[PDB]
Symmetry: C2
């Protein structure tokens, strides 16, 4: 009886999309997790969705995996729409309040403590842009760049698993390597 996992595939078609790495990684995770004993559901955001069904998917899942391309430093708009609908419309089930009862306690009013979430992101940026203190992101790391997305999930009470990132996906593609790496990441972080 391994955990229930919801994979949210936030792939977004783009005029200059070089391939289908997000679909590939979504299916790699689904296969890996099913082979290892989990029940798995997949939401493909760009196909549309019934908001209430998605809230019920969160309630059913023990772990949520967000598979997404980086668009302008964060999630594609379709995924922000998904969370602005799903999280908001889950009031009373995903979260109760901001947790205050007035200067302390903000973010402690979630209802789904015990559930975990993980970011799996595809970027053309080189890994160094995130870690070298003299570069664009001033060394805050991928998790610093995704801070608000992390905090939206944590407001619900969830805790994160380590982030998986593919870099230079346009200028230095490496699909077979990404797949092999991602399976190792899932073993280390979801199955431990």
């Amino acid at each position: 009886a391994m955990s229930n996992v919801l994979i949210i595939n936030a792939m977004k078609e783009f005029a200059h999309s070089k391939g289908a790495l997000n679909l590939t990684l979504t299916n790699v995770a689904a296969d890996f997790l099913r082979e290892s004993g989990h029940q798995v559901k997949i939401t493909t955001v760009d196909q549309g969705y019934d908001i209430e069904s998605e809230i019920e998917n969160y309630l059913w899942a023990d772990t949520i995996i967000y598979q997404m391309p980086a668009w302008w430093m964060g999630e594609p708009w379709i995924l922000k729409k998904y969370i602005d609908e799903v999280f908001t419309d889950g009031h009373g089930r995903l979260y109760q309040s901001d947790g205050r009862t007035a200067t302390k306690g903000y973010g402690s009013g979630g209802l789904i403590q015990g559930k975990t979430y993980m970011l799996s992101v595809t970027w053309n940026a080189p890994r160094e842009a995130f870690t070298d203190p003299e570069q664009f992101f001033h060394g805050v790391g991928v998790d610093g760049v995704y801070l608000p997305f992390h905090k939206a999930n944590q407001f619900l009470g969830m805790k994160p698993l380590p982030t998986f990132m593919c870099n230079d996906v346009i200028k230095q593609p490496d699909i077979e390597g990404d797949i092999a790496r991602y399976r190792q990441h899932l073993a280390e972080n979801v199955n431990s």
Copy 2:
């Protein structure tokens, strides 16, 4: 001959929207800036927009002001859609590339250096949630929470002006105070 300013009003109607603070602040900025000699254009995102016209608005503007409610720790999805369209579709005019020619230089390929941008945000969170190191955001400040939005604008070559934030807007409304404070902020940061 004061600068051209584009105000982007990202207000979003919500079933439980207590008022119209974003519309009010949009108009306060427009009035203030016109009184002080600037030409001002206003884009109301939730009304829809012609992507190319918006790119031309950026090229015309010297300063961009984003007036927006915080939704799940960041911009409402309608504004992420706006930037995913406008920034992307401005290739060759707003930005040329990521600036590399392969581990250094990411983010240095913008084309609109010289322009400035400013965030004006409305939050129900208390100011302490952002500054107290033991609270939800672990002291990174409002600018740390908006890091990816800041970096999307900086990728184009723009530089930021200090952020204006209204806090506890639902539980402790103070419209007249916000207006007075915001005028002082605009004087100090846009007109200096």
